[PDB]
């Protein structure tokens, strides 16, 4: 088990749907002798000695510049898209599509209140979840 | 309501006129206040001659400093501004005048017009970390013998960033990155909501 | 266990709670000093004044230092005290056997009882301090009983760390204070003449870095580590440097140990702790063990200082007027005989 | 740019003032380290000199390094005449702190933040 | 006579911080928002600039918060943007302007929402 | 030029100052004073502090005389707000004013004689010190450090019956005064010590800023009161003690007759102080009464928002001095719209006292030094802040 | 033990301080003295609650006791109010 931490505890880069990357500030600091998700891995590659390039987040910011574009800059959704080709693998691609009604997992609110780990950790959510039932 | 005495506020207005039209090269902006207070102010190369004209002219003898302080605004780009309030023991009055310096644009020192400035200039040094030039003995007043950083800048720490406490192991007293254990509890204030300017 | 939270310095928690007996004494200052540095919870128990124990409450923050009373001849007071630590360091010895305690008290009887309470508390780790060179069968009744102590120590806290210090010299030592005070003497009674008597000192601190680490490394159990120093010294540089810094004249004079254990008796003989005693005098004239193959202080992270550095600070006090103000430097280092 | 100038129209002028006060905290270290009794060598003395003086050799800019001096030429003063007592001496020397690490394993192993 | 520097003012060794806090803190500019709770927009006028969050383990004795980071409560008011970052710039700590983000005009009309078409 | 210092804890020096000297045989060739041993940060931890919660720091800048402190910051604050202070509250802060006065000059002048070594006075005037303490006591809550003069007025009403108590003891103080002078004022020895030390020009004392019965005792005729009111000190008639050939003996001779001339503005305030309130109305500058609070909603948002909020002072800047005992004690507030101040200089009379230590004590000897900072009532507290 | 039952433990770091020095708690806990407090009957559909003695009470509040359900309780008070 190598704790991590949650986004309330970490300046960490996150993207939503159409790509507009936004930054979580530290509103506190990680609990226990947790620490943030970069630097375990960082620290495990040092351990095994295939240490990674950066060592500071700025420096990490900066390797996700190399990989992708959208990290970097915030609050700025992507303009172009190139759905023409796009397209074309699609025609490429032949599958079947079952007879099967598609369904949402979220039939009805309760099904919405327990989702991920914090959620599922609350005792809020597990009220309003019961109130439900 | 106070008890404003229109007599004053025009008086002073016209004296602010005489000393704007006596020194038109230093007075920047002269006004004299709602609170029948005027604030002469001057660039800062004036700080010699402006001070001079007030200490010595029979019709504006401002004989003594009543003191010399520096407002740091970090947000204009000359942080500090010298304010010196002055005081006429004749015309029973007073004026202030304030200067504009920046860090590292010293301002001249009036320790010459006035020696009561001697002291309190080094309280700016100390506090703000102004520097005034021709000034006899320029050294901190205020601070710890050893301290580094200038305290009343807008930009530094309350708690600073060094205690003291004595350790047995040197048997001497000790200074050490500040610790503290109930940092103090900075409470929001400012109301979303603003006054109508009257 | 506590969670190390904090930046390291004073008000912030190191998750060490640890009793130690002895605090009341010359290294206590300083181990107590380290643990209320970084942090940790203290209790020190105590059976001198609360006068006496003031000097310890200045180090450490409010509420990391707890002194509880405590009488050696009671089971009972060492049972609480160990309650809820997690660490118990012992430092009980003295020189002078007294009256109502023997050497086999304070180094041997006693010491066993506290580690014996401290596992059916159940402290992680234990650090019993004997001396140095305390050969089973030395010439020190008190080298002697140490030894036979660390046997039992073993038996009740098995692994509980032992560090065996060499002369340890630091403000208020008796190693280093010990010789610059037989000025009284106007001679100075060495055997052989101060030589084959080859001694290594450590400071103080050292001694202590290294026991608070021994608290705090994993290595640590069921070693011996022995804290030695930085340089050996036959005594007689030992006692001529101490009185070259002190700048007091030396006159080094042969005396028989037989004569001299007389000596020893005499002062041991004064009812308020005597200035020397028969068994301070067999050690004295005790050379250190070779290096073996103990670890040492930098196995433990501290490096050793070397006596020269820190000597001036340790004996300014016994200086005179001008002397006081004379530096290391432009005085004469003496040679190191490792032999 | 366009700026007014202090003591020292380019950094060249500037550069022998430094040299003035290099000097004399030389000549004074080992006064006082016998004035205040401090239990230091004065050649480590001197070296604390020299690096107070060198942790500020990258700047090149004529006005700072001017009040660079007034300021380190006021410390002179103080630790001249016995203003600052031992413990504002010792001080410089950093004596009682514990040392932090700066490796990376190291930190991560101590600190949330780095 | 005036002389010619193209050197940033920085002025890092003059104000007296120590080395830690100058290259290990970051800053971020930014125009305060609305707590939702109040409608009052008199918070949401000056650009300010904070210094990164730090460490604030609990105390064993009294369980009061402490803080070992003495930039944490300081919060510097600077009225535009350039003005905060040449404070920055000058003091030597890292900055990361947010742009301000303003309400957008919205048009409202109380006949509109009477029709019943929609 | 032998140096030393005077040495923080001196049991003369007044609270500790590090006056370093240079003794010329027992002459002192050179006085540096060292200050800044007390600072203590007052003006910087104000700006992080609402109005109402900076007013005790005024009491502890020069605690000897704690009120008249208060009233500085307060004639301050209501300048900026434009409000002024009830007609009852101004006559209480002048009995209150006076009364203090009296409490610096009875510190003043017996701590003087206690360094020049007479000790009996000290004793003799503390008694009545005490007796005067109670009157903050019953009036304020506190012996010292009051907190009573608010920024829109006094916090509460007197007691129902302070007024009478501060009439018997006016009414004997007197003799009080008379005896110590009758020790003092022509003690074949106290002239000695005291005459012809320390001697100020008239024009070197308005160019150090002196500001006080340092100026009043050269002979320059300035008092604050007189030349520009504050409060009510306008309606009471006193005299100003002008002072010639100033030296610490006339000066003293100054701080004895402004302690009998507070006496008779005392008397007067006692005998004409209006019926009335004692806070400003504006519920937005001062807080609501606790009856009201409890029953009224506008009375309670009112209480809750100046207590945790604040006044909301209007953006501006003042500098407004008043005559504290020691002398000019001005506040120079710098204020934006916020509840919290943005600068408060606190012009200290006694900055510039001190630095004319240099200019005074020349040529003298180690026990002239004694004696002139005896003569310029210099607590640290106010110098360092 | 304790009102929200402090209770350094068994195993805490921190429960060493009581060692030969007591703990500081209460008894006649408020938490159960309202309510030992008997309910207040009324005949109005509101009723004010002074808290006691005006000035020296609460700020003053209305509870509507309008529903036998409920016996209103002044949120200062924690005085149940029977209809
Ligand atoms: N520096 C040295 O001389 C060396 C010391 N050591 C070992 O290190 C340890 C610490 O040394 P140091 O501090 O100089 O020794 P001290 O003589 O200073 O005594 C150490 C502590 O033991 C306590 N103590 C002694 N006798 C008794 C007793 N009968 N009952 C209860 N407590 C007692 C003392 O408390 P109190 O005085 O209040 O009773 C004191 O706090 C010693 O145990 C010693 O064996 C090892 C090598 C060299
Ligand atoms: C033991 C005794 C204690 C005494 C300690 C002492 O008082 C404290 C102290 O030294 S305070 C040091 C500050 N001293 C400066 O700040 C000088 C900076 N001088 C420059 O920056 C030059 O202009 C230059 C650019 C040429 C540097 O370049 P260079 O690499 O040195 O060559
Ligand atoms: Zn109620």
Known sequence: ILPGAAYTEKSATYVNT???????????????????????????????????????????????????????????????????????????????????????????????????????????????????? | VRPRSDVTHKQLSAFGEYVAEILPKYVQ????????????????????????????????????????????????????EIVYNLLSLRFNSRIRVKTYADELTPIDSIVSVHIAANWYEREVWDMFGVFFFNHPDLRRILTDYGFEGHPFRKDFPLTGYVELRYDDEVKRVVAEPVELAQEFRKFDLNSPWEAFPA | AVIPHGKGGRSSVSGVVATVFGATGFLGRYVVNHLGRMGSQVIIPYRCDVYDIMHLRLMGDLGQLTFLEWDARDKDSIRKAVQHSNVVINLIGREWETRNFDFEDVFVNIPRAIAQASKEAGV???????????????????????????????????????????????????????????????????????????????????????IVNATKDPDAVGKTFAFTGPNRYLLFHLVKYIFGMTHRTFIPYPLPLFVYSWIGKLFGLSPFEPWTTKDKVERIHISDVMPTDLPGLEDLGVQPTPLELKSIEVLRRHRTYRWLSSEIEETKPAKTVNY | TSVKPIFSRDLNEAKRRVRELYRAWYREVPNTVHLMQLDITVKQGRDKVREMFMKNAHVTDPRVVDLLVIKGKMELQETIKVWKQRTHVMRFFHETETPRPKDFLSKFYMGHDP | QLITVDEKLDITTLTGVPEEHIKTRKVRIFVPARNNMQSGVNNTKKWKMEFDTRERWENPLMGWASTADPLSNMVLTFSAKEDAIAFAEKNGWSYDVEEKKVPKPKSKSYGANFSWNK | NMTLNFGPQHPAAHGVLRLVLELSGEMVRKCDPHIGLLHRGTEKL????????????????????????????????????????????????????????????????????????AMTPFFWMFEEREKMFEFYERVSGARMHAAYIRPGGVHQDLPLGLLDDIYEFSKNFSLRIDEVEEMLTNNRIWRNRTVDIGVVTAEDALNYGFS????????????????????????????????????????????????????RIIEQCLNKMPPGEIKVDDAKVSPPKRAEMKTSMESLIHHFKLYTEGYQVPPGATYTAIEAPKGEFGVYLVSDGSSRPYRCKIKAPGFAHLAGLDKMSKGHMLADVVAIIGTQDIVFGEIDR | ITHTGQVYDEKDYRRVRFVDRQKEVNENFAIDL??????????????????????????????????????????????????
């Not at chain 1, 495990?44 to 060592?55: H, K, N, R």
């Not at chain 1, 490429?92 to 598609?102: F, G, I, S, T």
Request: net charge neutral.
């Open chain 7, 34 to 83: 309202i309510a030992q407090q008997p309910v207040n009957e009324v005949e109005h559909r509101i009723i004010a609650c002074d808290g006691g003695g005006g000035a020296l009470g609460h700020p003053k509040v209305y509870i509507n006791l309008d529903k036998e359900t409920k016996t209103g309780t002044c949120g200062y008070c924690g005085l149940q109010f029977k209809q």
């Open chain 6, 212 to 263: 006080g019965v340092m100026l009043r005792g050269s002979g320059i005729q300035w008092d604050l009161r007189k030349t520009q009111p504050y409060d009510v000190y306008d309606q009471v008639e006193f005299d100003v003690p002008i002072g010639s050939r100033g030296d610490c003996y006339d000066r003293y001779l100054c701080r004895v007759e402004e302690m009998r001339q507070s006496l």
């Open chain 2, 29 to 80: 902006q002269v006004q004299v206040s709602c609170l029948d207070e005027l604030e002469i102010c001057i660039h800062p190369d004036g700080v010699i001659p402006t001070l001079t004209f007030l200490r010595d002219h029979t019709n504006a003898q401002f004989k003594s400093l009543a003191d010399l302080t520096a407002v740091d605004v970090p947000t204009r780009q000359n942080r500090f």
């Open chain 1, 18 to 133: 159409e790509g507009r990357a936004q930054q979580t500030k530290v509103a506190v600091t990680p609990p226990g002798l947790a620490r943030e998700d970069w630097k375990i891995i960082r620290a495990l590659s040092e351990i095994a000695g295939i240490t990674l390039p950066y060592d500071t987040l700025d420096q990490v910011r900066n390797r996700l510049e190399e990989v992708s574009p959208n990290l970097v800059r915030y609050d700025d959704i992507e303009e172009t898209n190139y759905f023409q080709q796009a397209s074309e693998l699609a025609k490429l691609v032949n599958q079947e599509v079952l007879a099967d009604p598609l369904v949402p997992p979220q039939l009805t609110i309760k099904d919405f209140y327990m989702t991920d780990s914090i959620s599922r950790a609350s005792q809020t959510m597990a009220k309003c979840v019961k109130a439900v039932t």
């Open chain 3, 124 to 210: 992680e780790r234990f650090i019993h301090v004997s001396h140095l060179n305390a050969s089973m069968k030395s010439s020190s009744k008190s080298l002697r009983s140490k030894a036979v102590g660390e046997k039992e120590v073993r038996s009740v806290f098995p692994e509980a760390i032992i560090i065996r210090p060499s002369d340890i010299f630091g403000r208020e030592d008796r190693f280093l204070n010990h010789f610059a005070n037989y000025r009284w003497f106007l001679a100075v009674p060495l055997v052989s003449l101060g030589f084959k008597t080859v001694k290594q000192p450590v400071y103080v601190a050292d001694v202590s870095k290294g």
């Open chain 6, 46 to 117: 104000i700006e992080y502090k609402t109005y109402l919660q900076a007013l005790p720091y005024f009491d502890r800048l020069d605690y000897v005389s704690m009120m008249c402190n208060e009233q500085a910051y307060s004639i301050a604050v209501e300048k900026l707000l434009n409000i002024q202070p009830p007609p009852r509250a101004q006559w209480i802060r002048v009995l209150f004013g006076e009364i203090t006065r009296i409490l610096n000059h009875i510190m003043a002048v017996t701590t003087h004689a206690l360094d020049i070594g």
